[PDB]
Each structure stands twice: as C-alpha cells, then as structure tokens.
Design a protein around this ligand. Structure first.
Ligand SMILES: [Cl-]
Ligand SMILES: [Cl-]
Lengths: 124, 126
C-alpha cells in the first residue's frame, strides 16, 4: 500500500507511466522514478486503484490506458498465486481481465498465463 | 529497512542477487524472479551491522571475492548507507574490508570507491 514498484515475475520488468511523453508500458532494466506508483484501496472492499501523476490505470475493454477519471474501470483486485508466494494477478473489476504485458506494452488478458504475476513492493 | 525475507535488487539494472545451494551459484540475475533470490536480512551480533543469508549460509567478502560463508564470521557483517538522492536505496558496506557490494556482469563484487552500480533496494519478499 502506498508508493510502490509493480514488477513482473516472468521478466523482472516494471510497469511505468511517463507523463512527459504520455508513455505507458513495462520496462526491464534501470529503476527509473516513473516506475513508482500509488497503490491505494478503493471505496469497494477488495479493490484497489493504481495511480501515477493524478491518473489511474484503467482497462476499457480495448486497451490498458491511463485515465484522469476515477471511474469503474480503474478498479483492480489482487488474486493470490499459491505456487509463487508474494505474487498476485491483478484482475480488472469491470472487464474481468488480468493485467499482462506484450513486448513493452501493458495489455489485458482473460486467460491465465505466466506473464500475469506481479509483486508490488514499497518504493521507499 | 526490511528485516526478514527480502529481495536485494540493484537500481542500475533491476538485477537481483541470488544464491542457489544445489548449484553453489552466487551472482546477480536480471531476468525472471526465482525463489533463490529471496534472502534473510537479520541484525547481527554487533549493533549497526546486519547479515545477509540464504540456505543456512551468509554473504561475505574476504578482501578478494564476494562468496558465501557457512558460519557468521566477521566478514559476513554489512552496514547500510542511504543513497543521498534515491530514497529507499542503500549501499551495503562490508565492515571488515570497507568495500561496497557491487556487480560486474553476472557476478557480485565489492569496491571501496562509491560508484553508480552500488545502489540496492531491499524489499519484502512477502
Ligand atoms: Cl517515454
Ligand atoms: Cl521507465
């Protein structure tokens, strides 16, 4: 909870949002400050928002994007992965799809795949 | 300042220190997050210093190479130094040899001069 990095088990890459070029993605390598997110509990029990730069990570059924608006599609639940203690899938409430990656892009996927396992750890 | 099970990850490349007992393999890895990257960070017998342990062994520096130790020798004692412009990151300073935990390629090394590759974040594994 609070400021955190969001790192993928499969490749060690971290989600980032760069406001200076409006670039959302996943990056493997150096730990830049645009990889630091605000992970906050939402109004609805069991659901969270993932935010940077006054925007929220959302999935609109077509793309994973950043939203200025705290709307339904910004709600995510954590889903335990028993084989990998400390890792979670991030499941979008509205569209029931998992946060995933394809190359350097964040995507959503209803299938359960090895690239959907994330660890959220304190930035400071 | 995490105490207990943690990953030890480098700011410069996102790589994680690891020790695999079966393969007797110590290094840093920039790919997938495996179980053997989870360390036990504990307070030592001497205040101000910590041990860094896996598989009933301890990370040490003997003045030549960074290696594991079966026993908590003086060479297994490390202090934390905050990195001035990177809150959450630390240099790990070996007590006996005054050398900072560092890396070169896939290997852990130690260096007495402060450099850009010595910044570690120690984050809870669970
Ligand atoms: Cl960018
Ligand atoms: Cl980045």
């Amino acid at each position: 909870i609070g400021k955190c990095y969001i790192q993928n088990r499969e490749n060690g890459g971290r989600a980032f949002y760069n406001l200076g070029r409006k670039d959302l993605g996943i990056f493997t390598g150096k730990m830049y400050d645009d990889q630091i997110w605000s992970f906050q509990k939402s109004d609805t029990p069991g659901y969270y928002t993932i935010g940077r730069e006054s925007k929220f990570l959302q999935y609109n059924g077509e793309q994973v994007i950043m939203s200025d608006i705290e709307q339904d599609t910004t709600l995510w639940s954590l889903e335990e992965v028993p084989e990998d203690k400390g890792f979670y899938r991030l499941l979008n409430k509205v569209h029931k799809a998992y946060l995933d990656y394809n190359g350097g892009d964040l995507v959503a996927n209803k299938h359960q795949t090895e690239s959907e396992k994330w660890i959220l750890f304190k930035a400071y």
